[PDB]
Amino acid sequence: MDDDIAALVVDNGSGMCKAGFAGDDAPRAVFPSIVGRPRHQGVMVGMGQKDSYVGDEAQSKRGILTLKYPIEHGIVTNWDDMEKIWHHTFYNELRVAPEEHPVLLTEAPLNPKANREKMTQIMFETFNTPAMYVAIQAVLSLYASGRTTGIVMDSGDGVTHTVPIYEGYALPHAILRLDLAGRDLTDYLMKILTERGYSFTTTAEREIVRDIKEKLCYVALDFEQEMATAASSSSLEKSYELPDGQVITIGNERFRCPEALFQPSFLGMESCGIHETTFNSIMKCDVDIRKDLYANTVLSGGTTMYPGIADRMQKEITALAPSTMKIKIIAPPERKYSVWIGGSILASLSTFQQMWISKQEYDESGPSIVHRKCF
Amino acid sequence: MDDDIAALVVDNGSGMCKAGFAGDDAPRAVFPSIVGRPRHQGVMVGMGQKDSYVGDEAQSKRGILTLKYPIEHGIVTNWDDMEKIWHHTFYNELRVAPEEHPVLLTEAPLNPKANREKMTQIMFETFNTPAMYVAIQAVLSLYASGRTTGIVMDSGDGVTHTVPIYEGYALPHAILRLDLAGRDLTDYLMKILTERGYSFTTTAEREIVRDIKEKLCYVALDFEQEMATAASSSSLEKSYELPDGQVITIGNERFRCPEALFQPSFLGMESCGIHETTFNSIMKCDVDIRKDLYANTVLSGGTTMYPGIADRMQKEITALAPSTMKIKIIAPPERKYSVWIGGSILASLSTFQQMWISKQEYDESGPSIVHRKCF
Amino acid sequence: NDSSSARLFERSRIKALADEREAVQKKTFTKWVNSHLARVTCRVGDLYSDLRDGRNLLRLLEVLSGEILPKPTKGRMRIHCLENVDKALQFLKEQKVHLENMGSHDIVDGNHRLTLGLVWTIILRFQIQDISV
Amino acid sequence: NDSSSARLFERSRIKALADEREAVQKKTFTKWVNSHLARVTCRVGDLYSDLRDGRNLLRLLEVLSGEILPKPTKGRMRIHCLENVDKALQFLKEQKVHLENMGSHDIVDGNHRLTLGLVWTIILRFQIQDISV
């Protein structure tokens, strides 16, 4: 392990890949799960051909390039582009052959079956992986949270989860994924920012208003009162600056964007806010252990990086659950990264080091033993 | 009777209401116990206001509308919406004033006491009912089965029962209700259909995959051998089509969905399959008459409409009960409707025509005499 | 285990009993409405087409109540017809004929069980409630 | 009919006799374990905290058996500690100390009656069975 055999932990979450060797506290490779592909033509002799920009360089040439996630909400859409962000991960950040290493991958739960076995296959077959393991996100964020009791809410870039647990025992029927994450809120931010007259009809600036969002857009603790004092703009309005140099001013549009996490009717679905979803998970749980799910609501993921989330949570599940007892929420730092970090310590455990899908284990037995090891 | 005084039989089962006059062989009113309520807004001048769509019209506008059962597993949740499907029943299918008629209602046994007396009250008071009678489901399905000996298993849309009987004498302690019906299996079908990548996060399509289920999803006679030949998909896979025009293919997901009726661990509870539940009822029965419960297991209800049920039953209670003797199961046609039909002939019997909760019988005496007449 | 094809037979007889109801009931309405729309000299050989616009249902409610109701725009278009029935529904929700699937488009489409489901509820609130003059 | 408050007195004396057992028994273990962990120069003033990680129970089993046991990841977190005791339990179920409530979390939590309930069963399988070298 650890630059030896050294299980590669590669968190292939939507929006961002986060990769490092086993035991690493910091995924040295972090870069957006994107593939830049040029739109306009260029007649210049001696110019980077560069048909397929990949990952973080596509952040540099966002104007020309069509930015494209190869994955969508855990579901891998484009497999060779997925292999572009992989092979770039393994040869330009990890800078090593997976042909030696186990590859501890990370994947969203409640996954259609091709996105486990093919996510493993392109590792086993295009790459060589002497071993590997695709892994459920929220549990590994509990590995960096390091606990075994409560309910983990991993809102990465694509999917919010509510994954319960009680002393190592998970409750699968009470696990709920949901599409409320940073990829969604920037579309809501797009439709709600243009009422001020600012249209950004290009993915280049979808990530830039997502950058606005990941800085400015917090969660209203109470919502319509922040909209009530959105009448008199005192501090809610703030100036942002573009890479062009232009200035934005956003007021109420700040807090209401991640209110779609909490009132998805702003998006316009059936979906309740994330607090009713964890509460709905605990509906499905057992009256002895439902107490320990209240006081141990865990937060995780890149969309959960925003201010005002967790206090609205303690307010609202207090409104939902028996307020006779306590509803503490545990929101550690590095919650986007705790998914990866707890994997980077999972591979360190030698009992896990027998829980790998080895090479011939994939080859002769099946791609369905991926499902027998990863559930 | 019979367009005269004419006791209205209204089977208010979950999922579906089935209503007609006394003596009718066919409940002219059949429509889903739902209330359609719009989700998205519409700025169109001259548009059906229609805040509260009710019943079968909400099947037409399933996209906009939030489909909602006013009843849940016999337990009435929303009482005014219950009155919407009632008043629609009585003025758009039965098309008559209950102000004259007795209303022979049908209800699930082992009911908390408000769901009898208030189910009667909104009849007595919002409507007028000169008489009425809320009634146990499985017995009335035995009235259309027309027998007095055996054990009735009524799995409607919400609740499976096992209600024993012997020459008119029921065994109340041996009566067992259970939540294994069409409302549950479509949730299991939801979680097991998305492994192919098909998510349907809207109640509109919960009823559509329930429609898949009520067509395709039969019961595996033997289960894991049908899963063993689910390796080579020859006929188990079949094409379904959506109202959008898209195509599904489902293989093993067909038979395993109503296997949750038989192995509720696929749902994940303590609950044994329905065959162990009727067998558990006969544990509680008397050794003289336990023989006549084996050879006269009766089937009823809308979830029991599926192929492969009753032969798995005769196989499995043969595995459970003394196989020295015979375990015949009696599965008549119209078993969803036999609950209603046997009520539509119950009101015809003039000895039952003295067993009504009359008007002043409710008013001056009590709502608890409902319990004195209906048990 | 043959409740399925028996359901194909039973439901055909479910709505056979409902059509034996709704046709005689439509003629109950027909001689009832031609006892009233003959005051405005309108004759009904078909509820589902004559009172389909809504304005003709408005003519009936102007007869029964003996009152006047607004006649908004009519033509070929759907909105033309839905607005007219939305004035009928204005006076019918005024008369507490609910919107329990007794609709604008139900009259415009001529829905056999809810056009009569509306106007039979009009009978069940004419001889019960004050849809009359 | 006063068996209830008498149960509040009796159960207090149930576990009073059990604490008079388990404390002297903890010191039986304490001088027993400090006769062994002094080989690896670890001193025990508290079973329930010193051998709490599992790795320190692993140190004891490396002393008693005179062998080496794997030392997996340790830290602040629960999984860190449970894995360590799961290697101790690996060698203790190897020594047929059952999982009759003699647990990973029981050592991590420092459960007073099952941390000693584990390691006294280790005494009852050291001087009976081959937890020794």
CATH (domain of B184): 3.90.640.10
How many whole angstroms separate alpha carbon B339 and alpha carbon B373? 19
Task: Please state the separation of Cα A38 from the chain's center in Å.
Answer: 26
End-to-end CA distance of chain C: 56
- How many C-beta neighbours within 10 Å does residue B251 have? 20
How many whole angstroms separate alpha carbon B170 and alpha carbon D81? 57
Task: Provide the token pair at C69.
Answer: 């109701």
Whether A53 maps to a domain, the answer reads yes
Residue type, C58: L
Q: Please report how many Cα atoms fall inside a 13 Å half-sphere around the Cα of residue D103, on the Cβ side.
A: 13
| Antiparallel, parallel or unpaired: β A8-12 and A149-154 | unpaired
Same domain membership, residue B92 and residue B54: yes
Is B272 in contact with B264 (CB distance < 8 Å)? Answer: yes
DSSP B331: -
Burial class of residue A97, CB neighbours in 10 A (0-12, 13-18, 19+): exposed
Are chains A and C touching, using the cut-off of 8 Å on CB pairs and a minimum of 3 such pairs? no
Same domain membership, residue A132 and residue A60: yes
Picking from A321, A343, A273, A287, the residue whose alpha carbon sits closest to that of residue A171 is A287
How many whole angstroms separate alpha carbon D96 and alpha carbon A331? 41
Written as one string, the DSSP assignment of A254-295 is: HHHTTTTTT-GGGTTSSPPPHHHHHHHHHHTS-TTTSHHHHT
Between the alpha carbon of residue D44 and those of residues A28, B14, D48, D70, D108, the distances in Å are 41, 65, 9, 22, 16
In chain B, the number of structural domains is 3
- How many C-beta neighbours within 10 Å does residue A42 have? 8
Category of A297 on φ-ψ map: left (φ > 0), alpha (ψ -120 to 50) or beta: beta
Whether B233 maps to a domain, the answer reads yes
Task: Provide the token pair at B164.
Answer: 């024993």
Is B327 in contact with B318 (CB distance < 8 Å)? Answer: yes
Q: Which residue has the tokens 């661990």?
A: B265
Burial class of residue A243, CB neighbours in 10 A (0-12, 13-18, 19+): exposed
Element (H, E) at A84: helix A79-88
What range defines the domain where residue B193 resides?
180-271
Same domain membership, residue B190 and residue B215: yes
How many whole angstroms separate alpha carbon C130 and alpha carbon A259? 49
* CB contact set of A289 (below 8 Å; sequence gap of 6+): A166
- How many C-beta neighbours within 10 Å does residue A197 have? 6
Task: Provide the token pair at A267.
Answer: 């998006």
**Would you call A112 and B191 a contact, using CB atoms and an 8 Å cutoff?**
no
DSSP A136: B
Whether A312 maps to a domain, the answer reads yes
Whether B1 maps to a domain, the answer reads no
Method: cryo-EM
How many whole angstroms separate alpha carbon A369 and alpha carbon A360? 11
User: What's the gap in Å between the CA of C36 and the closest CA on chain B?
Assistant: 21
* CB contact set of A172 (below 8 Å; sequence gap of 6+): B268
Between the alpha carbon of residue D110 and those of residues A42, A151, D49, D81, the distances in Å are 69, 24, 7, 11
Between the alpha carbon of residue B303 and those of residues B250, B297, B343, C2, C12, the distances in Å are 19, 16, 19, 13, 21
Same domain membership, residue B118 and residue B64: yes
How many whole angstroms separate alpha carbon A280 and alpha carbon A173? 11
Q: Among the residues of B55-202, which ranges form H helices?
A: 79-88, 114-121, 137-145, 182-193
Same domain membership, residue A310 and residue A245: no
Partners of A163 in beta bridges: A152
Same domain membership, residue A233 and residue A145: no
Resolution of this deposited model, Å: 7.0
Torsions phi, psi of B154, nearest 5? -100, 105
| Antiparallel, parallel or unpaired: β A297-300 and A149-154 | parallel
Assess A283–B contact: CB distance below 8 Å, yes or no.
no
Same domain membership, residue B131 and residue B57: yes
Assess B360–A contact: CB distance below 8 Å, yes or no.
no
Residue after which a domain boundary falls, among B217, B246, B271:
B271
Q: Please report how many Cα atoms fall inside a 13 Å half-sphere around the Cα of residue A6, on the Cβ side.
A: 15
Same domain membership, residue A130 and residue A11: yes
| Antiparallel, parallel or unpaired: β A247-250 and A238-241 | antiparallel
Between the alpha carbon of residue D22 and those of residues D31, D47, D85, the distances in Å are 14, 12, 21
**Chain D interface, best mutation among A1, A165, A334, A351, by max D CB count within 10 A:** A351
User: What's the gap in Å between the CA of B19 and the closest CA on chain C?
Assistant: 10
A residues 153..172 contacting B (CB < 8 A): 171-172
Burial class of residue D46, CB neighbours in 10 A (0-12, 13-18, 19+): exposed
Is B132 in contact with B105 (CB distance < 8 Å)? Answer: yes
Spell out which residues of chain A touch residue B268, defining contact as CB-CB under 8 Å: 171-173
User: What's the gap in Å between the CA of B40 and the closest CA on chain A?
Assistant: 7
Residue after which a domain boundary falls, among A271, A294, A322:
A271
Length of chain A: 375
Whether A1 maps to a domain, the answer reads no
Is A37 in contact with A70 (CB distance < 8 Å)? Answer: no
| Antiparallel, parallel or unpaired: β B160-166 and B149-154 | antiparallel
Same domain membership, residue A332 and residue A205: no
Is D88 in contact with D118 (CB distance < 8 Å)? Answer: no
Residue after which a domain boundary falls, among A222, A249, A271:
A271
Whether B77 maps to a domain, the answer reads yes
Task: Provide the token pair at D65.
Answer: 């058996």
CATH number of the domain to which B323 belongs = 3.30.420.40
How many whole angstroms separate alpha carbon D112 and alpha carbon D48? 7
Same domain membership, residue B214 and residue B148: no
Whether A288 maps to a domain, the answer reads yes
Where do the DSSP E strands lie in chain A? 8-12, 16-21, 29-32, 35-38, 53-54, 65-66, 71-72, 75-76, 102-106, 131-133, 149-154, 160-166, 169-170, 176-178, 238-241, 247-250, 297-300, 329-330, 357-358
Helix axes B182-193, B203-215, angle to 10 degrees: 100
| Antiparallel, parallel or unpaired: β B247-250 and B176-178 | unpaired
Between the alpha carbon of residue C94 and those of residues B127, C91, D42, the distances in Å are 19, 5, 89
Task: Provide the token pair at B113.
Answer: 């006491």
- How many C-beta neighbours within 10 Å does residue A312 have? 23
Same domain membership, residue B131 and residue B96: yes
Is B202 in contact with B231 (CB distance < 8 Å)? Answer: no
Q: Which residue has the tokens 């991640």?
A: A258
Same domain membership, residue A375 and residue A326: no
Whether A216 maps to a domain, the answer reads yes
- How many C-beta neighbours within 10 Å does residue B223 have? 17
Where do the DSSP E strands lie in chain B? 8-12, 16-21, 29-32, 35-38, 53-54, 65-66, 71-72, 75-76, 102-106, 131-133, 149-154, 160-166, 169-170, 176-178, 238-241, 247-250, 297-300, 329-330, 357-358
**Chain B interface, best mutation among A270, A285, A287, A370, by max B CB count within 10 A:** A270
